[PDB]
């Protein structure tokens, strides 16, 4: 009921809906999601401006380019074998950056794309950090405890 693909997919999907400013009822986002949307967006804003020039030099023209780019970037970022909550937060930030570029550059505009982004984001998080996340208290006893308002 946490640490599972479904839960992580819902987190990744919530963050994209927030970035894109589309409403998703279902009785509202979890406390975890609310805390994450806040801190991830804070990182996205800073990373966007610092990485501005570099990003102008890539055209995210499709979901496949987004996936490949995401995988290549995430692989280099985590190649040192280190994992922590700060780093996991940046995965969402970069997810947000990607969807924005895709909204502006996607050749065949698809209104479900953010569902497929959320998918491979959760896929990467699952396969590469799932065990670490578990051993560190999961989302509600790890991430939330660390990042919630004091």
């Amino acid at each position: 009921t946490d640490c599972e693909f479904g839960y992580i997919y819902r987190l990744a999907q919530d963050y994209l809906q927030c970035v894109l400013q589309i409403p998703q009822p279902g009785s509202g986002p979890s406390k975890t999601s609310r805390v994450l949307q806040n801190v991830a967006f804070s990182v996205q804003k800073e990373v966007e401006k610092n990485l501005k020039s570099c990003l102008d030099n890539v055209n995210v023209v499709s979901v496949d380019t987004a996936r490949t780019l995401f995988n290549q970037v995430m692989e280099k970022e985590f190649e040192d074998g280190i994992i922590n909550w700060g780093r996991i937060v940046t995965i969402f930030a970069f997810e947000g950056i990607l969807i924005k570029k895709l909204l502006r550059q996607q050749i065949a505009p698809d209104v479900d794309t953010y569902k497929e982004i959320s998918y491979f984001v959760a896929e990467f998080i699952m396969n590469n950090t799932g065990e670490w996340i578990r051993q560190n208290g999961g989302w509600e006893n790890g991430f939330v405890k660390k990042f919630e308002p004091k």
């Binding site: 570099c54 990003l55 970037v73 970022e77 700060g86 780093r87 970069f94 990042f147």
Partner: peptide
């Protein structure tokens, strides 16, 4: 490429800065 490296390296540094920054046990 240097763009995926430039991206990954910057995300990593931000990630680590945000991490040690948060709680400070």
């Amino acid at each position: 490429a240097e763009l995926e490296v430039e991206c990954a390296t910057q995300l990593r540094r931000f990630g680590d800065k945000l991490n040690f920054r948060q709680k400070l046990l």
